[PDB]
Amino acid sequence: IEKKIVLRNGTEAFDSWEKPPLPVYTQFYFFNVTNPEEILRGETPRVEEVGPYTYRELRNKANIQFGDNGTTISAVSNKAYVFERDQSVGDPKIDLIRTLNIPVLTVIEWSQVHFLREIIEAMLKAYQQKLFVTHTVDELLWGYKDEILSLIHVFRPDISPYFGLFYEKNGTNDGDYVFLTGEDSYLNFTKIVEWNGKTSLDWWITDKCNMINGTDGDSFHPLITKDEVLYVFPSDFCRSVYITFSDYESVQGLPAFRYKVPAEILANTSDNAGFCIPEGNCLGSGVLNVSICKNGAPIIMSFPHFYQADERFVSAIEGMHPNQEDHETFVDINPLTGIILKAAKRFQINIYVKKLDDFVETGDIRTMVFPVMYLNESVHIDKETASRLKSMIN
Ligand SMILES: *[C@@H]1O[C@H](CO)[C@@H](O[C@@H]2O[C@H](CO)[C@@H](O[C@@H]3O[C@H](CO[C@H]4O[C@H](CO)[C@@H](O)[C@H](O)[C@@H]4O)[C@@H](O)[C@H](O[C@H]4O[C@H](CO)[C@@H](O)[C@H](O)[C@@H]4O)[C@@H]3O)[C@H](O)[C@H]2NC(C)=O)[C@H](O)[C@H]1NC(C)=O
Ligand SMILES: *[C@@H]1O[C@H](CO)[C@@H](O[C@@H]2O[C@H](CO)[C@@H](O[C@@H]3O[C@H](CO)[C@@H](O)[C@H](O[C@H]4O[C@H](CO)[C@@H](O)[C@H](O)[C@@H]4O)[C@@H]3O)[C@H](O)[C@H]2NC(C)=O)[C@H](O)[C@H]1NC(C)=O
Ligand SMILES: *[C@@H]1O[C@H](CO)[C@@H](O[C@@H]2O[C@H](CO)[C@@H](O[C@@H]3O[C@H](CO[C@H]4O[C@H](CO)[C@@H](O)[C@H](O)[C@@H]4O)[C@@H](O)[C@H](O)[C@@H]3O)[C@H](O)[C@H]2NC(C)=O)[C@H](O)[C@H]1NC(C)=O
Ligand SMILES: *[C@@H]1O[C@H](CO)[C@@H](O[C@@H]2O[C@H](CO)[C@@H](O[C@@H]3O[C@H](CO)[C@@H](O)[C@H](O)[C@@H]3O)[C@H](O)[C@H]2NC(C)=O)[C@H](O)[C@H]1NC(C)=O
Ligand SMILES: *[C@@H]1O[C@H](CO)[C@@H](O[C@@H]2O[C@H](CO)[C@@H](O)[C@H](O)[C@H]2NC(C)=O)[C@H](O)[C@H]1NC(C)=O
Ligand SMILES: *[C@@H]1O[C@H](CO)[C@@H](O[C@@H]2O[C@H](CO)[C@@H](O)[C@H](O)[C@H]2NC(C)=O)[C@H](O)[C@H]1NC(C)=O
Ligand SMILES: *[C@@H]1O[C@H](CO)[C@@H](O)[C@H](O)[C@H]1NC(C)=O
């Protein structure tokens, strides 16, 4: 019998939940575009992998308020990134990556449908823009100021002049959570009962696809069994996800279940039909159109190098060489305590791009899902926390 693991002040679990002792690392990998003018004339894109750029994460919960007798708890997870130079391939402020111009592809999408109405497109033809641009890794991640966005900001202050993939994500949270702690049942430990004051999502077609299942992914309920499926809600992924048992593992001195993300998640099927907007029509297996959660931006999520995806996605881009061991998402969980020992959470950011006759910027470019960057969010238990854990077992 152990629930030493519940969120209650003074307990083992709560302190660890509030200020995680295990350091998490996020490393970024970029795809440098080697043939922009040839792509614009309709040839196959050739890219180059650049990285890692390693950032150590700072984690803790704020806004903590207990609720409902000690069954529920409200919190926000703040997260910050500290760059590690010696563990990275180079200095992200010096290093240049050439890739798609995301701000202008974004406002274009905004023009055809109207998030921004059509009419200020006349900016684009006033100031002509290149589809492929060159910025530093630091500019691409943490933001830079854009010509066209700046011009719009004048008329629409609600719209930011700045764009970055992770822009204004440093030292902030993903929004308001209320977590279900474990004292009604150990099973429902650190389970998510709401996000921004709503119990389900807006975005997806089906009821079911809009469901929020599982934990935030940083931990799991104790006494996990091999047979059972484990649910996660990665907010940034804009949908719930489950992982399934793969193998038995050992991390440090501790036994572990190896849970991985199955191919069922991104496959074009059945249950996943609700993720294809607007009608049940999917780009294919292995991709997720997140435009809805990404502010109307033509962003397509996928796994690194289109791992677990239709091959035509891989074939479309020269330089995509997917493999299981490098690009898979796995989590090694201590079965008894539901604690994560080792994990690699990996996913890719891509951009949908197609030829447009109203926009000369698009040229003759092929219709494809264009890779920009992927990442590995990892954690590894040290031996002093491990051995202390393995004596605490008894
Ligand atoms: C991803 O792919 C992109 C595009 O292919 C690469 O971006 C290029 O990066 C290289 C450097 O790695 C750049 O080449 C350098 O440009 C510098 C800037 O040139 C301007 O300024 C100088 C004055 O300082 C002017 O004379 C010049 O006309 C330009 O106006 C130069 O300063 C560099 O010169 C030095 O380079 C080598 C030594 O490094 C020597 O041979 C030279 O004599 C001199 O010492 C150099 O020419 C290039 O401009 C970038 N291209 C673009 C489009 O931005 C990324 O590097 C690549 N990413 C990775 C990780 O590889
Ligand atoms: C986070 O994710 C990234 C991306 O997956 C990951 O970086 C990768 O690490 C792996 C493991 O170290 C690297 O794979 C190696 O590649 C070199 C290239 O020559 C090989 O020599 C290595 O081969 C050894 O191990 C293999 C295991 O099967 C054997 O097949 C082989 O014969 C050797 O024994 C190994 O394959 C990979 O190159 C990097 N990728 C990048 C882009 O850096 C990172 O490790 C993950 N975790 C952490 C904590 O960073
Ligand atoms: C990825 O997902 C995106 C969003 O989930 C997809 O974009 C959606 O699908 C198409 C884009 O081609 C749009 O459908 C058109 O919408 C426009 C705009 O409608 C609005 O404006 C009219 C008139 O101003 C107004 O009456 C309406 O109420 C709307 O407010 C119409 O002109 C078209 O006829 C057609 O309806 C969707 O609107 C668009 N949605 C969003 C939220 O952007 C995108 O296509 C997906 N990508 C892939 C590759 O599948
Ligand atoms: C989050 O909610 C549930 C997690 O369990 C996911 O939906 C579940 O999907 C399975 C199969 O796809 C359903 O199995 C069904 O069993 C019931 C009877 O028990 C029956 O009505 C069906 O015919 C089928 O046999 C399961 O019931 C269903 N869960 C619920 C509550 O209906 C859902 O996909 C998850 N969403 C995400 C985004 O992960
Ligand atoms: C994200 O924010 C954190 C803090 O909120 C930054 O970490 C600090 O950076 C300053 C300036 O580089 C240093 O003086 C501090 O020592 C850092 N704090 C710690 C705990 O080391 C971090 O640099 C920011 N990262 C990015 C990419 O902006
Ligand atoms: C995703 O799956 C659906 C079916 O679940 C595909 O639609 C089918 O397309 C094939 C073409 O090979 C036809 O034979 C079927 O009759 C179609 N069925 C339906 C219900 O449309 C759809 O094309 C798939 N998406 C992609 C990108 O391959
Ligand atoms: C968690 O506790 C039990 C175990 O599954 C379940 O019946 C209950 O509905 C859950 N509580 C909430 C608030 O969802």
Numbering used by the authors: 37 to 430
The authors write:
Here we present the structural and functional studies of SCARB2, a functional receptor of the important human enterovirus 71 (EV71). SCARB2 is responsible for attachment as well as uncoating of EV71. SCARB2 is ubiquitously expressed and serves as a common receptor for all clinically isolated EV71 strains, CVA16, CVA7 and CVA14.
Thus in nSCARB2, α5 (residues 157–164) adopts a short helical conformation. Helices α4, α5 and α7 are held together in a compact cluster by hydrophobic interactions involving residues W146, L152, I156, Y163 of α4–α5 and I184, L187, I188, F191, I195 from α7. Under neutral conditions, a cap closes the entrance of the lipid-transfer tunnel of SCARB2. N325 is located at the bottom of a cleft formed between helices α11 and α12. Man8GlcNA2 protrudes to the surface out of this chasm and stations itself in vicinity of the cap. Notably, the sugar moieties adjacent to α4 and α5 are stabilized by P314, E145 and H150.
